[PDB]
Design a protein around this nucleic acid. Structure first.
Length: 150
DNA sequence: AAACATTCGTTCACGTGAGTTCCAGTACAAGTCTGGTC
């Protein structure tokens, strides 16, 4: 949906943005949410989030992890911490339709292994790590973002 | 007074360090390939 009147995810989150924010760019991941369990349907069997069938009870959820512009302010060159803080003041999350990915501060390896073990326990792919001072470099790989899997 | 031994500047050979050119190997970007799913 390109307008609040008609869409599959936008008609519900039109009014989820604080009044001050008028121009806003966000980056995130789109996934499928099962409400009867209140759990995210892991990608794979029984559904594709690209061409979901209307009759299905599953719905679309947007998990945000970055902001690149708010009220004609260019946040590309700022540090990750600042972008996170500004992101916290964009929308009031409304579970099931738009959310912010939680990030935990960690400064030891035991924490990383604990997180990976817990992720495997919750049947997730893995865990990723972000450098607090990393800048957004479009199209580049392995600059401030790292991923870890079993 | 004559013969023999020692010494010194000279010569050759051999060994070691530094500069130059050519080539083997390595890390990573990008192209290409492929599987599964709806």
């Amino acid at each position: 949906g390109a307008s609040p009147t008609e869409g599959s995810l936008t008609p519900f989150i039109h009014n989820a943005f604080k009044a001050d924010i008028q121009i806003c760019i966000l980056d995130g991941e789109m996934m499928a949410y099962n409400p009867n369990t209140q759990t995210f349907m892991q990608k794979g069997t029984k559904f594709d989030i690209k061409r979901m069938v209307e009759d299905s009870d599953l719905q679309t959820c947007y998990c945000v992890f970055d902001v690149l512009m708010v009220n004609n302010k260019k946040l590309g060159h700022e540090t990750l911490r600042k972008r996170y803080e500004i992101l916290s003041s964009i929308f009031t999350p409304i579970p099931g339709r738009i959310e912010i990915v939680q990030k935990t501060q960690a400064h030891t390896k035991n924490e990383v292994i604990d997180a990976l073990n817990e992720a495997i326990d919750k049947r997730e792919e893995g865990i990723m790590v972000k450098q607090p001072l990393s800048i957004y470099k479009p199209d580049k790989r392995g600059e401030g973002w790292l991923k870890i899997k079993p």
